[PDB]
């Protein structure tokens, strides 16, 4: 069971820096929440572009 | 650290979205897709809060 995604050391550092400098303005209370919101926004964008705004079904 | 935590369900949604859209989105690997999504967010934040410049830690 995988609960993480690989980003790389440098990218994680860039994300931490971006978070520190912008999280109050963006309304994110934790780094975990910042990451979750960014990734969920991408999935939603792809649903809109390619799946008529509907959720994609996971493969059974 | 080289990873970020997303949780089991979110990882599954990311894998599904990647599988179904990667070719037209221009990503050859899942990690490339993840990197691009997160880099696009950092870039969006740079534009909004730092006039498009790279972020720097306070020293």
Q: Flag if B7 and A36 touch (Cβ within 8 Å).
A: yes
Give the residue among A4, A6, A39 at the shortest CA–CA distance from B42: A39
In the block, tokens 């730092």 appear at B50
Question: Which among B57, B9, B6 has a CA at the least distance from the CA of A22?
Answer: B57
Place of tokens 């006039």: B51
Domain range B1-59, CATH class: special
CA distance B7 to B45: 24
Q: Domain spanning A1-60 has what CATH number? A: 6.10.180.30
Scored b (16 or more CB within 10 A) or e, B17-30 reads bbebbbeebebeeb
Partners of A5 in beta bridges: B4
Nearest CA among B6, B40, B8, B46 for reference residue A46:
B40
- Residue B12 buriedness (CB in 10 A; 0-12 / 13-18 / 19+): middle
Tokens 């979110």 -> residue? B10
Between the two ends of chain A, the Cα-to-Cα distance in Å is 15
B43: its two tokens:
């870039």
CA distance A60 to chain B (A): 11
CA–CA dist A24, A36 (Å, integer): 16
C-alpha angle with apex A10: B45 to A17, nearest 5 degrees?
40
Give yes or no for B52 touching A (CB within 8 A).
Answer: no
3-state secondary structure of A53: coil
DSSP assignment of A29-49: -SHHHHHHHHHHHHHHHHHHH
Closest A-chain CA to B3: A6
Half-sphere exposure of A50 (CA within 13 A, CB side): 18
């Amino acid at each position: 069971v995988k609960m993480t995604v690989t980003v790389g050391e440098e990218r994680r550092a860039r994300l931490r820096t971006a978070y520190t400098l912008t999280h109050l303005q963006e309304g994110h209370r934790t780094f975990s929440g910042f990451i979750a919101a960014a990734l969920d926004a991408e999935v939603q964008r792809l649903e809109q572009r390619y799946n008529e705004g509907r959720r994609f079904e996971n493969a059974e």
